[PDB]
From a paper:
Evasins are chemokine-binding proteins from tick saliva, whose application as anti-inflammatory therapeutics will require manipulation of their chemokine target selectivity. The A3 evasin [name]-[name] ([name]-A) bound to CC chemokines and inhibited their receptor activation. Structures of chemokine-bound [name]-A revealed a deep hydrophobic pocket, unique to A3 evasins, that interacts with the residue immediately following the CC motif of the chemokine.
In the [name]-A:chemokine structures, the side chain of the chemokine CC + 1 residue (Tyr in CCL7; Phe in CCL11, Leu in CCL16 and [name]) sits in a deep hydrophobic pocket within the evasin structure, possibly enabling the ~35° rotation of the chemokine relative to its position in class A1 evasin complexes. Moreover, we found that mutation of Cys22 and Cys51 to Ser, giving [name]-A(C8), resulted in significantly or substantially diminished binding affinity (or loss of measurable binding) to most chemokines. Nevertheless, this double mutant co-crystallised with [name], with the only structural changes being in the immediate vicinity of the mutated disulfide bond. Second, the additional disulfide bond of class A3 evasins enables the formation of a deep hydrophobic pocket for binding to the chemokine CC + 1 residue.
Residue numbers in the entry:
A (entry chain B): 8 to 68
B (entry chain A): 23 to 103
Write the structure that this text describes.
């Protein structure tokens, strides 16, 4: 389906987050994509502890 | 805005998904694939006749300074729907 070419190097918009998902294993890069309220998808490095904590925060709601 | 997921082309031989060319849109702006990223170098006609069915032999390449540099390899590619 879709793959990430670059990681968002900045702060993640926790309170604007709607959901998250994982890109396919067939992508060249591993990625966690965040989807915001207003529809923006943001590629994120799955090894970044900030990214992991964002996913943990979002899934725990 | 360049850290968004991008539409790629699918293949039949079980290998890594690859970009059409070396550029992609995010938020309405065009960004460049990173150097070394896997890509397809299609002719104009191939882009025009690309479908969601395998029907086309696509030249594989690596992105270098925004160009899809062919590595001599060919594989069937087609649009993810």
């Amino acid at each position: 389906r879709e793959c990430c070419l670059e990681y968002f190097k900045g702060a993640i918009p926790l309170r604007k987050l709607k959901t998250w998902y994982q890109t396919s294993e067939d992508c060249s890069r591993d990625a966690i994509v965040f989807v915001t309220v207003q529809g923006r998808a943001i590629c994120s490095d799955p090894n970044n502890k900030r990214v992991k904590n964002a996913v943990k925060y979002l899934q725990s709601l | 805005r360049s850290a968004c997921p991008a539409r790629h082309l699918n293949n039949t031989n079980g290998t890594v998904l690859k970009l059409l060319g070396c550029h992609y849109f995010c938020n309405g702006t065009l960004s460049t694939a990173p150097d070394g990223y896997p890509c397809y170098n299609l002719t104009a006609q191939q882009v025009r006749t690309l479908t969601t069915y395998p029907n086309t032999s696509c030249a594989v390449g690596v992105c270098m300074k925004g160009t899809c540099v062919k590595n001599g390899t060919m594989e069937q590619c087609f649009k993810t729907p």
